[PDB]
């Protein structure tokens, strides 16, 4: 199936409290593999997945050096943005950056991303043609011109279409056992009477990987989108995910409802009915 690799960077200023907090994490699909925490003792890029631990010191020394360069860039960015929007040097602010690439089921380049946000709001992003930019406001346009003059977009497409896809593949290979696995969800339902005339029917999807999944409830085969309590897909903590969906059913009508499950790990969609 499809795959992706992306780096997430969060920078938070700490006025009068010293250096800005900086955190970086890398993911291949839904598995995190590296991290860097400006407040940590090592001051180095660190492994968060078993399959990346085999990389030698050359890899860790290199990534530690580049991630520190990122840290410094965002430390300069915080001050610049503070200036662009004429803000008090006393308040705390946040800058986030995300970039990466997607490859199809054929492991071939599908698309590249490079987005930036200031205080949780879109600031600037690289368009899909990897040649132009989307500037949120006037401050962003100033950054856009700067990046255009420095031919930043060009350097980004080379990384996104080359290096990014190349290393993603390498990671997928080195981590075949983890990254290339598909754990079809384990499913089951629970029934709990809220009153003498209504009951809760909950549909569970457990231990599945990857995270992408579709879980719905239907009544007489019709969608119940608005009468369904659907929770956000969540991490189990062991690399797998979970999710459930529930509907309040009039006692005696359990048979009219069906749970539907779709996942890459299931050759054919599942349909469950309490009976």
């Amino acid at each position: 199936g499809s795959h992706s690799m992306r780096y997430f960077f969060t920078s938070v200023s700490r006025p009068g409290r010293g250096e800005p907090r900086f955190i970086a994490v890398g993911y291949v699909d839904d598995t995190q593999f590296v991290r860097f925490d400006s407040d940590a003792a090592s001051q180095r890029m660190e492994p968060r997945a078993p399959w990346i631990e085999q990389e030698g010191p050359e890899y860790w020394d290199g990534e530690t050096r580049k991630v520190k360069a990122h840290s410094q860039t965002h430390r300069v960015d915080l001050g610049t943005l503070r200036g662009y929007y004429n803000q008090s040097e006393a308040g705390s602010h946040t800058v986030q950056r995300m970039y990466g690439c997607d490859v199809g089921s054929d492991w071939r380049f599908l698309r590249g991303y490079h987005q930036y946000a200031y205080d949780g709001k879109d600031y600037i992003a690289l368009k899909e043609d990897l040649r132009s930019w989307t500037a949120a406001d006037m401050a962003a346009q100033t950054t856009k011109h700067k990046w255009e003059a420095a031919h930043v977009a060009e350097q980004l497409r080379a990384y996104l279409e080359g290096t990014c896809v190349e290393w993603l593949r390498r990671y997928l290979e080195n981590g075949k056992e983890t990254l290339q696995r598909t754990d079809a969800p384990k499913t089951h339902m629970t029934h709990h009477a809220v009153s003498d005339h209504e009951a809760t029917l909950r549909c569970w999807a457990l231990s599945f990987y990857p995270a992408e999944i579709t879980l719905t409830w239907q009544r007489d085969g019709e969608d119940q989108t608005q009468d369904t309590e659907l929770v956000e897909t969540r991490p189990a903590g062991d690399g797998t995910f979970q999710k459930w969906a529930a509907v309040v059913v009039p006692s005696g009508q359990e048979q009219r409802y069906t749970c539907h499950v779709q996942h890459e790990g299931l050759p054919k969609p599942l349909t469950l009915r309490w009976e």
Partner: peptide, 9 residues
């Protein structure tokens, strides 16, 4: 791996 260059805003 991370990208090489990182220009400021």
């Amino acid at each position: 791996i991370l990208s090489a260059l990182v220009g400021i805003v």
